Symmetry: C2
Subunit: 97 residues, 2 copies
């Protein structure tokens, strides 16, 4: 699979789980599915944080499909960008230490 080229929207706001992760649900509104949900997690220095995605490589299976994404945000501020281009969405998360 290649990365989805189209727009995503938040289907369920990012929320903390009980086992030290967060989960967010996104709806894929674009074309070219099945395709990989583009997900990048960066710290305050805009540097990528690796290995924090818990879900097996999240896919948008079809146009309008909803995908569950489980993440393990680092401590402090992280900026999670889902999608590509001008329609990419950013989620700011703060994890208290």
């Amino acid at each position: 699979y290649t990365m989805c080229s189209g727009k995503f929207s938040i289907d369920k706001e990012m929320a903390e789980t009980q086992h030290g992760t967060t989960v967010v649900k996104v709806k894929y509104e674009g074309a070219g599915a099945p395709c990989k949900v583009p997900i990048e997690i960066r710290d305050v220095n805009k540097e990528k944080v690796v290995g924090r995605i818990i879900s097996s490589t999240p896919l948008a299976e079809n146009t309008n499909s909803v995908t569950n994404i489980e993440l393990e945000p680092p401590f402090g501020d992280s900026y999670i960008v889902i999608g590509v281009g001008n329609s990419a969405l950013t989620i700011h998360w703060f994890r208290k230490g």
Copy 2:
């Protein structure tokens, strides 16, 4: 910057340099520039190979702009995917050991 959402084409075929790298030039034909050229390098097991991009984070500055990309392919077979979606291009490279 976010990742470019649009189509790229090969402007200059991937070629070996003298100092143990390769260089390929791509033309960005899409919108939303300036944006980051999406580049992933995977091995035969389709696993990402990290730290092989020599160029500072390649950008497409504008629609129709041409970007120079210097890479350090791993030994053996690597598959370099530029772009996203159904218009993403794949380059197969073999590096003799």
